Design a protein around this ligand. Sequence first.
Ligand SMILES: *[C@@H]1O[C@H](CO)[C@@H](O[C@@H]2O[C@H](CO)[C@@H](O[C@@H]3O[C@H](CO)[C@@H](O)[C@H](O)[C@@H]3O)[C@H](O)[C@H]2NC(C)=O)[C@H](O)[C@H]1NC(C)=O
Ligand SMILES: *[C@@H]1O[C@H](CO)[C@@H](O[C@@H]2O[C@H](CO)[C@@H](O[C@@H]3O[C@H](CO)[C@@H](O)[C@H](O)[C@@H]3O)[C@H](O)[C@H]2NC(C)=O)[C@H](O)[C@H]1NC(C)=O
Ligand SMILES: *[C@@H]1O[C@H](CO)[C@@H](O[C@@H]2O[C@H](CO)[C@@H](O)[C@H](O)[C@H]2NC(C)=O)[C@H](O)[C@H]1NC(C)=O
Ligand SMILES: *[C@@H]1O[C@H](CO)[C@@H](O)[C@H](O)[C@H]1NC(C)=O
Ligand SMILES: *[C@@H]1O[C@H](CO)[C@@H](O)[C@H](O)[C@H]1NC(C)=O
Ligand SMILES: [Ca+2]
Ligand SMILES: [Ca+2]
Ligand SMILES: [Ca+2]
Ligand SMILES: [Ca+2]
Ligand SMILES: [Ca+2]
Ligand SMILES: [Ca+2]
Ligand SMILES: [Mg+2]
Lengths: 676, 912
Amino acid sequence: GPNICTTRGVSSCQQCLAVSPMCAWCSDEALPLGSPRCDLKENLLKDNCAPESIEFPVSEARVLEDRPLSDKGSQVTQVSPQRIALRLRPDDSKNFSIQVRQVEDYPVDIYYLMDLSYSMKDDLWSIQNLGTKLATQMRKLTSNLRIGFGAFVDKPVSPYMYISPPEALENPCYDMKTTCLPMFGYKHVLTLTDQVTRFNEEVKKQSVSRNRDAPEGGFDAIMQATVCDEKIGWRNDASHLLVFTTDAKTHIALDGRLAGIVQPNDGQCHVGSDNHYSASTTMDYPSLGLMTEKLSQKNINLIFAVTENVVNLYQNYSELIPGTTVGVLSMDSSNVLQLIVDAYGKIRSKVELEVRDLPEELSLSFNATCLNNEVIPGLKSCMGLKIGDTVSFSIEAKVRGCPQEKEKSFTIKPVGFKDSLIVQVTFDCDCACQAQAEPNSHRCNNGNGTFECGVCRCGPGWLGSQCECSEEQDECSPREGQPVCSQRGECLCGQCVCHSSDFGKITGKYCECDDFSCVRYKGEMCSGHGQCSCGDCLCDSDWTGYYCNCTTRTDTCMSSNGLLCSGRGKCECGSCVCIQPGSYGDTCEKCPTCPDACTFKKECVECKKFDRGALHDENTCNRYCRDEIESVKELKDTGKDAVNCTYKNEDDCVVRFQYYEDSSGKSILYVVEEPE
Amino acid sequence: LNLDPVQLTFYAGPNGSQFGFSLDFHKDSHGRVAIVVGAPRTLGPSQEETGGVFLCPWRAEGGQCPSLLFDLRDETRNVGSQTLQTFKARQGLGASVVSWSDVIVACAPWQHWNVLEKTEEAEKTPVGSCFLAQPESGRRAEYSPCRGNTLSRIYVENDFSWDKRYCEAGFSSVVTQAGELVLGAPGGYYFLGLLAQAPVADIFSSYRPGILLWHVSSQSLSFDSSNPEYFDGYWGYSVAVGEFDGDLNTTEYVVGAPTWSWTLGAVEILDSYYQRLHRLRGEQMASYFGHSVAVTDVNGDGRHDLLVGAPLYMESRADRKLAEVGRVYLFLQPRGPHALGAPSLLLTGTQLYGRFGSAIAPLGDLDRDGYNDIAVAAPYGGPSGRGQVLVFLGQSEGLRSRPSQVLDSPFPTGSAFGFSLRGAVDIDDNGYPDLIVGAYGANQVAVYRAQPVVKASVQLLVQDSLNPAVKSCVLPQTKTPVSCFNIQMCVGATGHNIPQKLSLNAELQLDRQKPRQGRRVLLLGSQQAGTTLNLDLGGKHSPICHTTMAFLRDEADFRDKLSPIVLSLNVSLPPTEAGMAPAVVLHGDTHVQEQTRIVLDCGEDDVCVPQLQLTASVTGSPLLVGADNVLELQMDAANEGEGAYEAELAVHLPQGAHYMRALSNVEGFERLICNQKKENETRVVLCELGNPMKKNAQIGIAMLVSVGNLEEAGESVSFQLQIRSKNSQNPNSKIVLLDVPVRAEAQVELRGNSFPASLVVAASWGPKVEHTYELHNNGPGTVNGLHLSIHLPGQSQPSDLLYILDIQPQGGLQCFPQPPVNPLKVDDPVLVSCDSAPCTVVQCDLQEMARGQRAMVTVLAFLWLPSLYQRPLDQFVLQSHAWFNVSSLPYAVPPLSLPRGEAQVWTQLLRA
Ligand SMILES: *[C@@H]1O[C@H](CO)[C@@H](O[C@@H]2O[C@H](CO)[C@@H](O[C@@H]3O[C@H](CO)[C@@H](O)[C@H](O)[C@@H]3O)[C@H](O)[C@H]2NC(C)=O)[C@H](O)[C@H]1NC(C)=O
Ligand SMILES: *[C@@H]1O[C@H](CO)[C@@H](O[C@@H]2O[C@H](CO)[C@@H](O[C@@H]3O[C@H](CO)[C@@H](O)[C@H](O)[C@@H]3O)[C@H](O)[C@H]2NC(C)=O)[C@H](O)[C@H]1NC(C)=O
Ligand SMILES: *[C@@H]1O[C@H](CO)[C@@H](O[C@@H]2O[C@H](CO)[C@@H](O)[C@H](O)[C@H]2NC(C)=O)[C@H](O)[C@H]1NC(C)=O
Ligand SMILES: *[C@@H]1O[C@H](CO)[C@@H](O)[C@H](O)[C@H]1NC(C)=O
Ligand SMILES: *[C@@H]1O[C@H](CO)[C@@H](O)[C@H](O)[C@H]1NC(C)=O
Ligand SMILES: [Ca+2]
Ligand SMILES: [Ca+2]
Ligand SMILES: [Ca+2]
Ligand SMILES: [Ca+2]
Ligand SMILES: [Ca+2]
Ligand SMILES: [Ca+2]
Ligand SMILES: [Mg+2]
């Protein structure tokens, strides 16, 4: 029976195992010439092939380390399996389950940056007691906490500060009656310490400086806090938090030209033995990509803390820098505590997986499956997690060809967490009859050819096990009307030798299927995200759709309610399309004609309790019914902050409940227990 | 394109220094041309880095530079009580070196001046300066336009404003060709920005050596502003001159503002009196939109086209979400005072942290093609990370997104190669505007020399078909029966200033796509695959055509007689000369492929005259403009005559059309239907059959037409179909023209409902009731003069069951009720209709509505307790209807239907 194994691979065992996983090769030299060598295993068995000549290569996702994920972070592994001896074959993919899981009691590193310009004085006088009030809270969320302190103003150089009289070179603060400290760019103060009181001791002795222009030099301080791993005191098995407070704009790169400071920031850290950013007056400000990659590599989490006067700027920033959270800081600065706790709750909630050192020929399609069984296709991150929760993923890697490097590796890692998966990738591209080749076999035209895997390699224009024929006649095409060898070969002795091609090689039993002739999307072969299959685009692992236009993007599809395109709408190519008429918004969340929470979201009383109705044979019964089911019994709160509602059931009974919104949305039910 | 990177000569200058950082082509004492290269931090008089300005001449040896001498020797005086001194230490003289016809205007943007208020002080604030030294000596006179004294507190104004100490004059300047001088000062009015202007003819006059305070009567500075957008905008970071917004004599300004609107940044266009004309907003936050502003005519229309740099631009990719690759915007100038909207195109570098867009220097017609070309430098680009310079070439649409040429940094890591560029002036009278690139980290300046360019033109001429029966030649030295046929080649190269000794190696290959034992055609004499011919193109632009004598091999030599014969042509310059530096740089088309076949399948009459027959039809005649149109045009191609070679259909599609796929008399496909008419020539890019068409063969092709967003298609579009073949006599069939009309009827759907529909009774003003009516032209076609008529039972009287409180129409729709609603705020069912009872018709009119727009109108009302309690055992049904219509469509004759519709609203009452 002709199949893909038959009409395509008629050259070698290697191609037979490269086409499809099912394809099997027989190396028995006594097999009659004409029968398909690469075919179904049962077919080869039916042709009494030698069992040692039967080739049955199978890929595997073999786990080397499967250590249990710990209960407490007191090594503690969050990612299982720890290390994968992945083994892949050409143009094949393989799947495997990874259970990322945020262990409670993970150590926390906090480095409290701080601005020190002239407008920062009151906030300093308020933050003098910060740090014991941060530990007092964080003792609930982790067992090991270490805090650090910093400072920054701007580049110590004209025109950015006041320098006259020549006695104001030391004191830019003379024109006003009070005096304040000189120029300085960044000065590390305290290294991350277990004794939290050290931060309180260190901040008291600091004092405000003065500059001229409103923006300040914070980016230099952040980069230096990041890069001096040894100086700061970073842990490796902990959570790194970087708190960055200010109350005005912040200078960016190339702003330093106004002083003649033109050397771009090298990314190294120049904090000498005096803890002062030495190259402050000779090195430019830091870009935004250097910032991001240095925060990534050191597993650093950034928490901005602007004053409303600027949030819209910073939140317009913490969005071009993943892993970042912005906040409102009061002018007195008495809210940075609760801001930092909320930011810690937020950073741990989101659970995203990043892939590093992934070779170009490999593509990974994720397929989340967060809490419940939401096998949410095309998703690689989950929200709404709680500390102690476990998640699972279905990640599948597809290789494009058999790469020259036998052993390659890449890492899949949770955001800002130590433990991560190391992938040992092996490209198996070796047969068994290859090792027992017989070069210069006398049967190959008196001994001028090499015999291997049941074929004598005759010279050009000659074919067969003995090169019996050169010129001549058999049927070289599947159909009479079809051209001989698909206009691509010669009917040489009943076999179609494909013509030479500059671009590559022509394959197939009759030179029928090519390899470089597929369609495009945007000037790119199958959108640059697919692979060429005899006239049709086939996508890679993480490319969905027929045209391979779009990957597992969801960021714009994510809705603040907690699902893709809110309820109505498919997330096609990272964008949400409204399906319900009259509904609009970022994810079609706003709908004036749509039923309210009291009308449509009653299936908690129908699907969760007294299971009946629709959505019973599908995984959507508790998909929408996942709110807090409070067991209230007709409380005397029939409408004070929301709209109270009551409906009539089939048996003429009333059920009273009320939940509209408390703080930007609350999935809390107030359904009564016993209906009346 | 040329920018020879093998001899980048080096004007090496004082070791330390930053020799570089700024430069400009300037004249000599008697005509001629030299090079003025800035060099901060050089030649300290008392060993403090003052930063002299060098005057490097032109020489290929790349020596050191003579100096333009200034009075770098301090100046000091006092009028009556102000001991003012202009401190001269730690400034970057040469940071801008802009010149004029006989005047060097080299500036020292961080120069000082200390406005003490006698005992009190207001600081040595960098007032900048511009040391206007005249070459040929003469008055070496200096004028810092911000040198107006102050007693500090008087003109702090108590606003901190109306005072302009920190100008940093010289941070940018372009001597206007009229004879003025602008001195962009990013520190004007507390860093908000400045722009000081002054004539150059009179400025030399108004100098008193030794004087510290004096203001020229002809100064004109930008006015302080209080808009919190501008606050610390660094306005005037970089300036330019250009006839942008139609102010010819009051020639505009292109004042940059790379950090405006809270780091968004902007590039503003202003007149001579500092009045804005447009404003270009930055696309990405913190991307530094406007670091380097270049004004040039890329599209070759006569209108100056703005180019804006965003050096810290970060891009999002599948494999990398945040990658600093830089971005350069382009804004083409539309006719009239039309506003500059979205960026016309975006250029983008590939190297990480390359700071792409950090310096844009209009190179002029670098390849002399009629379109201006620019240079965008990457200080930290290149695979190694030492720096790159990427050159882009302009065209009618704008700039091609891929760099035509790229230069790698020859100086080591840290050299900041490419920080500053210049163009527009040939440095050696070679006919091409060279480029002079600074590397301030390496204290050197490497100049790249544009070499004369040739335009490659490739053309391979072969006979239309091959007839085995015609054997009029013989194979030399043998007797092979050859179907000989002549093949001609033609390649020309034009250009300006081409060297008088220029030659090319014309190589032609026969039987290309086929191997040694699969060749069908060879050279008669040498019996070889091909040969190379010599051409002398030195000083001659017309092409050279040579014809080769090609033959057909024997029938028994090879078996394949049906596979097509494919030929490929290549043209390349002779091998590089000693010392590298190729005399020219080759660009344009380089590879061309042509194919022919043997006369076959024309019958038995030897007269192969095809008769291709095509039938066409139109589906989906009403074309909604920019809709989800699914059009499957079906045509059948038949050859009632004889064999047609490479006969394929060429169809001209509009700009908005896209190909989704398709089968056809395929049985060979369903996803592939190609299309010819692709950009220039390529009038064959479509699929083949001509391969060839068998006699009486009948293949019908079905392909999908997806009408995309095309609002500029016009009143109609025309589709042209004709089968194109390689034949000479009757090459194509009869022309099939399909004028598929675009007569656009937009579908507008009227909807309406009551909120709540039902009304239950629980156990003084009642709850409010909302009636929702939504208007949305889901039909993508545009409608003008849309009319909405609201018909309601009664006249909104209090005697009715419902009392209308107010009508709140949003979405830009205006309604006119009669009689007007809300005369008072207050707080067997009978069919009462609009026609029977007196009616209050509310008419809403829309002059113009865009595609996909939506409208929303909210109706406010309240319940009546006395009326509700009446008839407790009676059921009340409330009915309201809405009607709408479209008066006409903006088309001559769309005789299908005037869009209209209606809505129904139902309200019921229940008993508890
Ligand atoms: C952070 O970014 C957001 C988004 O860019 C900024 O707000 C939005 O900015 C756009 C661009 O101007 C505004 O569009 C404008 O709308 C007005 C009419 O509303 C129109 O006249 C303008 O021509 C333009 O089309 C958009 O309205 C605006 N939206 C908001 C929420 O303000 C935001 O300001 C940025 N934060 C800051 C202050 O840097
Ligand atoms: C992403 O994950 C989903 C879930 O694994 C994949 O969709 C699924 O496709 C598989 C078959 O490939 C289905 O497996 C079968 O499920 C039934 C029970 O429904 C079971 O009885 C069978 O033994 C088998 O396991 C799976 O149900 C189906 N799940 C759904 C509804 O999503 C999806 O293909 C994955 N995306 C890719 C292509 O990686
Ligand atoms: C997960 O991996 C297994 C094993 O590789 C895949 O098994 C395939 O199963 C289908 C259906 O029987 C076969 O047609 C394929 O030939 C099998 N492939 C291989 C390589 O064994 C399974 O499809 C994979 N699923 C995903 C989505 O990766
Ligand atoms: C210039 O200064 C550098 C750095 O101090 C030094 O290495 C070099 O030798 C000096 N001059 C040269 C080019 O010899
Ligand atoms: C030009 O390129 C083609 C391949 O595209 C090559 O075959 C040819 O040899 C090259 N130039 C010549 C004429 O040698
Ligand atoms: Ca403050
Ligand atoms: Ca500052
Ligand atoms: Ca003019
Ligand atoms: Ca133009
Ligand atoms: Ca050009
Ligand atoms: Ca030149
Ligand atoms: Mg400040």
